[PDB]
Chains A and B, each alone.
Chain A
């Protein structure tokens, strides 16, 4: 299963 960062700001 793919794990990813997520943007903020």
Chain B
């Protein structure tokens, strides 16, 4: 049974990830998101779509990744039931409405994203589409959640030569050579994300900007934060920081707790 377990509400959005509806689990009124993905658009499979494999690998009590509650196969599609925080806003819309974020808030958000991406990598999962559009803010708890694992892959140490994430977050070695390694490409996208948070939009729109190696700051940003961004956006992948080096960076120290973040910046 699928139409009897959940009450379907309005469409929340559609795109490369499929179509996602608001829903409620009938048994206990739990808020959920109901995500439909057409089979003809699923490139990678595992043992079910790769998206389901990856979501199951990262599922746990840890709150930094979206929780897959259940899934169903239909003749032409798969349906994924995801936890739904309420109230919620994705980080793209949040930055559009707020503009450039205060660095204390960017620090808290960026820290939580780093913890979530570390969790993915610990679980053998490479997300490959880290961006503000794919991060949800649980506004009451001040907790961020990664969503949209449909571009992801099993984490490996050899080279990737396929990519279907977001090009303006993709690294210059992908643009130039169609070759990247998982961790250093993730760090590049985290540099784009951090710039996005503290400047109000991403730094690069065009391939020539991505490979050019120049970061111009369009908002007042602290020297420490600029340093961390430029390090994550190093042109040479081996010149980028590890996740440990990012979290030990001086700009990242004294992070707010999630509930402190909600009370100061979200309530």
Measured as residues with beta carbon below 8 angstroms from the partner, the interface class of chain A is: under 10
| B241 contacts partner chain A, Cβ-Cβ < 8 Å | no
Contacts of A6 in B (CB 8 A): 131, 133, 166-169
Question: Do B164 and A5 have beta carbons less than 8 Å apart?
Answer: no
**A interface: dominant SS:** loop
Picked from B15, B16, B148, B201, the residue with its CB within 8 Å of the CB of A3 is B201
Is there contact, CB below 8 Å, between B92 and A7?
A: no
Docked pose: A9 CA to B131 CA in angstroms: 13
B153–chain A nearest beta-carbon distance, Å: 13
B90-131, CB < 8 A from A: 92, 96, 129, 131
**Which residues in B have their C-beta under 8 angstroms from that of A9?**
15-17, 41, 150-151, 164
**A9-B92 Cα distance, complex, nearest whole Å:** 17
Query: How many Å lie between the Cα of A8 and that of B200 in the bound state?
Result: 21
Residue from A1, A3, A7 within 8 A of B166 (CB atoms): A7
Give complex CA distance A5, B169 in Å. Answer: 12
Q: Which of B133, B151, B200 contacts A5 (CB 8 A)?
A: B133
- Taking CB atoms, residues of chain A closer than 8 Å to B201 are 1, 3
Report Cα–Cα, A2/B57, bound state, in Å. 38
Q: For A5, give the chain B residue with the smallest CB separation.
A: B133
Please give, as numbers and ranges, the residues of chain A lying within 8 Å of B151 by CB-CB distance.
Answer: 8-9
Checking B41, B92, B96, B164 against A8 with a beta-carbon cut-off of 8 angstroms, the contacting residue is B164
* Residue in A1, A5, A8 whose Cβ sees the most chain B Cβ within 10 Å: A8
- B36 to chain A: closest CB distance in Å? 13
Cα(A2)–Cα(B123), bound, Å: 37
B165 at the interface (CB under 8 A from A): yes
In the complex, what's the smallest C-beta–C-beta distance from A1 to chain B, in angstroms?
A: 7
Q: Residues of A contacting B131 with CB < 8 Å?
A: 6, 8
Cα A7 to Cα B17 in complex, Å, equals: 9
Q: A3-B96, A6-B167 are in contact. List 12 more A-B contacts (CB 8 A).
A: A3-B200, A5-B92, A5-B133, A6-B133, A6-B168, A7-B15, A7-B166, A8-B17, A8-B151, A9-B15, A9-B151, A9-B164
Q: What are the nearest 9 A-B pairs in CB distance?
A: A9-B16, A8-B166, A8-B16, A3-B201, A6-B166, A8-B165, A8-B129, A6-B168, A7-B16
